[PDB]
Design a protein around this ligand. Structure first.
Ligand SMILES: CC(=O)N[C@H]1[C@H](O[C@H]2[C@@H](O)[C@@H](CO)O[C@@H](O[C@H]3[C@H](O)[C@@H](O)[C@H](O)O[C@@H]3CO)[C@@H]2O)O[C@H](CO)[C@@H](O[C@@H]2O[C@@H](C)[C@@H](O)[C@@H](O)[C@@H]2O)[C@@H]1O[C@@H]1O[C@H](CO)[C@H](O)[C@H](O)[C@H]1O[C@@H]1O[C@@H](C)[C@@H](O)[C@@H](O)[C@@H]1O
Length: 158
């Protein structure tokens, strides 16, 4: 498969999964169109009891109270729907394969959430899908929709 690509600011094409390989706690990527969609994935290592941590999302430092009592890495999707609106934990992937996925498709962003090995795809709407840029902080792989079954096997089995 195609990569790794090195961390960078990326404008992702339609009909391609970004398989993103997180190597450490912190921001995994920051995704926005600056209109109706912000999404940042915070990674939290196993056995973190509720505590406050500082993260730098979209050029501003921000504190989140995070906990992971599981023996599995947790990837918290932090969504907001306008620039002047506050962040929410919309979805959680719990996985020791430490891969997230992102796909621009059919005027929606699809991602993996739930627990491996039965993590599943879910969509989020946007009215400006094409102007979604993304700062990715780890090595990533590009998979075509043509090979979408492979993206699935990797999220859930590594
Ligand atoms: C039923 C389900 O899929 N629950 C998920 C939940 O999904 C919600 C999200 O997709 C949000 C995103 O904004 O949308 C919700 O639907 C809205 C809808 O969009 C509105 O239009 C509508 O009017 O209202 C509905 C509300 O009904 C979806 O319900 O996402 C959470 C967050 O990721 C997920 O919980 C996580 O994953 C589980 C495994 C566990 O680790 C949790 O702690 C995580 O936070 C929900 O999954 C279920 O979680 C349950 C307990 O909270 C059980 O654990 C259950 O086993 C989980 O379900 C399994 O995993 C799911 C990912 C999915 O694959 C299910 O088919 C499967 O049974």
């Amino acid at each position: 498969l195609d990569g790794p690509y090195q961390p960078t600011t990326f404008k992702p094409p339609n009909d391609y999964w970004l398989l993103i390989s997180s190597n450490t706690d912190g921001v995994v990527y920051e995704s926005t169109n600056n209109s109706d969609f912000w999404t940042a994935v915070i990674a939290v290592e196993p056995h973190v009891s509720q505590t406050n941590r500082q993260y730098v999302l979209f050029g501003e430092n921000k504190q989140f109270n995070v906990e992971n009592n599981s023996d599995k890495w947790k990837f918290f999707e932090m969504f907001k729907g306008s620039g002047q609106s506050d962040f929410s934990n919309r979805r959680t992937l719990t996985s020791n394969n430490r891969l997230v996925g992102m796909l621009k498709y059919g005027g929606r962003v699809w991602t993996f959430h739930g627990e491996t090995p039965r993590a599943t795809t879910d969509s989020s709407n946007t009215a400006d899908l094409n102007n979604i840029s993304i700062i990715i902080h780890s090595e990533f792989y590009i998979i075509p929709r043509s090979q979408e079954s492979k993206c699935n096997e990797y999220i859930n089995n590594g």
